[PDB]
Backbone:
């Protein structure tokens, strides 16, 4: 080879082709946002919140809050379930891990 | 009065004791696709150099060095120099787990 550690590079490139690295940047980008991360975190502490709790927790308009929640929802960071009113919860125990490990690391 | 004030207030109080800001900085570091690739590739080998990394990404050495600088300022990678070989490894097991849990959650 006229190259550089080609065997290793080939094999790690083959590993990368096995996983959805595009999809992980999407999910981490959803969570990383300042207000989104505040949301995810609140949902770690209480099971369900409505959008107005979230507007008021963050100190943002409801339109701001719905936007953030939609973003979260599409990536599976959050669940919902609609009397007239949407209740929101963590999209899975995975998401509690992500935040709580993240938390623990920066310590 | 206003809306759900004491519950809002409670929760604002949790949030204030926690470094949400720093978490958001870490995930932002990891979340860019090329950096997310460098991150994942360091979950596979204990150590890699800037050259393995450019070659795995198919990028210039300069362009790998800049994403690695960005990863390293956030704690996401460490290195040990070798004499002009800079050898990166993950910044901690926590970084393996965020990536791996996010990948497996995306599988569902
Ligand atoms: Na408010
Ligand atoms: Na946005
Ligand atoms: Na960069
Ligand atoms: Na660690």
Residues:
């Amino acid at each position: 080879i006229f190259g550089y550690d080609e065997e290793k590079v080939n094999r790690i490139q083959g590993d990368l082709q096995t996983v959805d690295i595009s999809g992980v940047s999407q999910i981490l980008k959803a969570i990383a946002d300042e207000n989104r991360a505040k949301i995810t975190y609140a949902l770690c502490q209480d099971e369900e919140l409505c959008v107005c709790d979230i507007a008021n927790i963050l100190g943002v308009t409801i339109a701001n809050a719905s936007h953030h929640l939609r973003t979260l929802y599409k990536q599976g960071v959050v669940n919902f379930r609609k009397g007239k009113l949407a209740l929101y919860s963590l999209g899975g125990e995975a998401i509690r891990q992500i935040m709580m490990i993240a938390l623990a690391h920066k310590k």
Q: What stands out?
A: The longest strand of chain A covers residues 78-81. Strands of chain A lie at 78-81, 87-90.
